[PDB]
């Protein structure tokens, strides 16, 4: 069934689950050709597969070569996503396989369900939550590994850095979605907010800066002000 605001704590219970976002799988630049027609050039993409309890992110990089000579690429991308998620589940020991997979766009439901017929006990679900996982490519270290890749490749991250040492997964998810929402609404400002203090660095083995508890509250406030600021610029309120 659909995941929404009524059953939101289910994300953080002890049943293994993954979110799958396919927004950034098939990415193109659109340009004019010499003859003045339009054509696309594809660039590297990625599947964003995330355990919201642990922060474990399975970043499957989608190299442009996987589109070569294929037709109807927007449709193929949903099936390529479903094929790679199925491949991931099969590669995991049984006790690590998810009990549920939540897709962020409903168009992923059939492709994934078809690829996972072999796993009838894994529930494939949509969600009414609008999650900002498309902004994942505003995270510099993630964007860099996607663009540098010369072959298909899976890279594993913890998108919560070390936060779970200090906060619950519910709070770490809330932080993450507010950070991603901010980067999605105004990327420049969000990054400005995150780095304006050169004395807070990003550890080589982390994605986000090493903010103290107190500094995270400030940062969170500034991000909410930004999302409100942009809402105001947008709708003229």
């Amino acid at each position: 069934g659909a995941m929404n605001s009524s059953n939101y704590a289910e994300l953080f219970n002890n049943d293994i689950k993954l979110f799958v976002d396919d927004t950034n799988v098939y990415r193109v630049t659109v340009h004019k050709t010499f003859e003045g027609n339009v054509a696309t050039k594809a660039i590297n993409g990625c599947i964003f597969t995330l355990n919201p309890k642990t922060g474990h992110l399975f970043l499957k990089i989608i190299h442009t070569s996987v589109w070569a000579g294929q037709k109807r690429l927007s449709q193929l991308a949903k099936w390529k996503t479903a094929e790679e998620v199925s491949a991931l589940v099969r590669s995991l020991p049984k006790e690590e396989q998810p009990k549920q997979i939540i897709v962020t766009r409903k168009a992923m439901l059939d492709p994934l369900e078809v690829h996972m017929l072999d796993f009838p006990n894994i529930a494939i679900r949509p969600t009414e939550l609008r999650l900002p996982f498309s902004a994942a490519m505003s995270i510099d270290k993630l964007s860099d590994v996607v663009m540098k890749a010369t072959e298909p490749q899976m890279v594993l991250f913890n998108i919560y850095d070390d936060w779970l040492d200090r906060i619950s997964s519910y709070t770490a998810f809330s932080r993450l979605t507010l950070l991603l929402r901010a980067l999605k609404t105004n990327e420049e400002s969000a990054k400005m907010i995150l780095l304006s203090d050169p004395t807070i660095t990003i550890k080589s083995y982390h994605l986000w800066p090493s903010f103290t508890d107190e500094q995270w509250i400030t940062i969170e406030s500034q991000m909410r002000d930004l999302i409100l600021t942009e809402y105001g610029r947008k709708y003229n309120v």
Binding site: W79, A82, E83, D110, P111, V114, H115, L117
Partner: protein, 300 residues
């Protein structure tokens, strides 16, 4: 021509015989139906006047025996039975015929409707779908469920139609997920036609029988089966040319015969719009599309 004689008509009832129907009043001197065309399967069906709940009836072929109908006052319905004494049966039929106590199967000579609805419907095909093999005729009613409906509850009183399920391992070859989901030709041609049904005659058989049971009994699971079987063909990129042509003919006469006033509960808007306008065979069913558009344009 053959006869289905009746012991009596003790309760008021609407009687169906193939695509015809007539009213019999409580204790009216009715003793059955004569001049039934030999050569086709037939169905005789019932709706009680005091309880339109439970339409029910019997599929039969007069070439396979001498059958008759008697009301059963314990079970409360008109039952088909077989008289094995041929002498007794001819004699019983001749006296009612002489007293003119029987209605005549009213086949107009120009009229191929029944043939066109049953072209692929023989009793050997029907026997694969229902389970009750002590009789040479087969009982169906409004509320019988299908084997697939039981999966989703008595198996003795079920319709054994073949389970069609587009998101099932049978429908989808490992490694051809996208291909086999978006183009059902493997499922239609290799799994169903070459593997479960054997030829397109047993396959159009079940199709036609499913429609007839939906229409005559309002059997909801038969209606699902008819739509599923259509959609599998229309959703297959590769279908033999002769099946598409015959399918167009099958459907044309089903649509032509459907009561206008039952169209809302017998026709699935999604399947038909998909089949006629989006599917691989959107341009391959000229006769059916033309009749659907002129008869049920609301649904489209």
């Amino acid at each position: 021509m053959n006869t289905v004689p009746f012991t009596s008509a003790p309760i008021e009832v609407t009687i169906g015989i193939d695509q015809y129907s007539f009213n019999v009043k409580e204790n009216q001197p009715f003793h059955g139906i004569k001049d039934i065309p030999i050569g086709h399967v037939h169905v005789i069906h019932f709706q009680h006047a005091d309880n339109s709940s439970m339409r029910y009836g019997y599929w039969f072929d007069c070439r396979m025996g001498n059958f008759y109908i008697q009301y059963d006052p314990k079970d409360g319905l008109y039952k088909m039975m077989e008289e094995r004494d041929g002498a007794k049966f001819e004699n019983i039929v001749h006296n009612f015929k002489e007293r003119q106590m029987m209605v005549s199967y009213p086949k107009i000579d120009e009229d191929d409707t029944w043939y066109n609805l049953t072209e692929f419907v023989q009793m050997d095909k029907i026997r694969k779908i229902v389970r009750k093999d002590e009789n040479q005729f087969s009982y169906v009613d409004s509320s019988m469920t299908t084997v697939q409906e039981n999966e989703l509850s008595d198996p003795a009183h079920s319709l054994n139609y073949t389970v069609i399920n587009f998101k099932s391992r049978e429908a989808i070859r490992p490694g051809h997920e996208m291909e086999d989901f978006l183009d059902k030709s493997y499922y239609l041609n290799t799994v169903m036609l070459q593997g479960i049904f054997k030829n397109s005659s047993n396959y159009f058989g079940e199709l036609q029988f499913a429609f007839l049971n939906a229409m005559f009994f309002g059997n909801y699971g038969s209606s699902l089966q008819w739509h599923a079987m259509i959609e599998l063909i229309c959703s297959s990129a590769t279908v033999p040319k002769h099946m598409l042509d015959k399918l167009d003919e099958i459907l044309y006469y089903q649509i032509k015969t459907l009561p206008e006033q039952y169209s809302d509960i017998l026709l699935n808007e999604r399947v038909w719009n998909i089949c006629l306008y989006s599917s691989f065979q959107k341009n391959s069913l000229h006769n059916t599309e033309k009749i659907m558009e002129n008869k049920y344009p609301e649904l489209l």
